[PDB]
Amino acid sequence: QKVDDDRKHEIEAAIVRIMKSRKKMQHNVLVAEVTQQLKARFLPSPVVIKKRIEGLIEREYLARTPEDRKVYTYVA
């Protein structure tokens, strides 16, 4: 439950932080650009910033098309 809660808060901080930067990315340019725009780096934990924007593919506002990542619906 410690590691479950530990992962719970860091993914919550991960999503909150990225929607503030909120720019379109090809596949790897902004996912690294968002990390340097935070308070104390290493907290992001990239393993979660990739699978939760991949978890965002079910809906709009960066629908993040699965294969050729480029349709990041920049309208919301």
């Binding site: 909150v16 503030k20 720019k23 379109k24 920049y74 309208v75 919301a76």
Partner: protein
Amino acid sequence: SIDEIYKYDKKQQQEILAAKPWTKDHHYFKYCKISALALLKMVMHARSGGNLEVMGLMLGKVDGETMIIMDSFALPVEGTETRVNAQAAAYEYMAAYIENAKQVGRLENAIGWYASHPGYGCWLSGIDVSTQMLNQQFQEPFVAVVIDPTRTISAGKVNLGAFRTYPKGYKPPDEGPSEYQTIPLNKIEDFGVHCKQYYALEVSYFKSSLDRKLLELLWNKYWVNTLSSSSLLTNADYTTGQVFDLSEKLEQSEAQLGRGSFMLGLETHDRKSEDKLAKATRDSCKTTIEAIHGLMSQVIKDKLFNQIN
């Protein structure tokens, strides 16, 4: 009468809001008149935002095909918009300020919103277009104004645009000068996707007592260094891009005229061709007169300083 525009006629505004002439034409609103106070406040907010986008509300009114702007005010953005949109405690301060202005006098209501694009030009992004389309569905008479503090410094003249969206499904006519603007590569894709979903209003002022005082004062105060070289137009960028846009428009008109010469009895083509040529001519004339004024000031000041005696 310079101050006539400052008179507020509530019944006349109610009559215009009941008439809704903008529903009869999606190109109804063509002009945007901005007060000196409004301009200054907006530019100051944009530059205080620095490299970060800020936004606010514009207070004003409508007059025929013209939208007028007078005021603008910041909304509590705790943690730089940590919630959805740059609002947070929005109408909290807004409605208080509004009742307070009905109390201290200011009766002009919401006429639009302004947003800043530090260092990436005046236009509407996808998000901006969705926002303005919503504003054109609830507060129909609304205008999306975009400012640029970084280009305000670079070019020297304030980079400002006023825009209105087209309703979903509606296509613009062929007529459209579309001035060229330098858009950075991280924004150009979105720009291109949404650039035809809105149009630009003609932004104009009307002098005024607010202008007379403000202008005179700050002018004398800081322009003792009246030189500032004399040609901030020396930077190719602006002038070059404007001339390129002119060339493109005129070449498009020529291609049209060449194809329309075969069709006998198409008056609309002649109309739009003449209008496009005329727009191109006035744009060129304004650029020319600006350059001539710059040269005049340069020549007079340089002759006075160098070999007066």
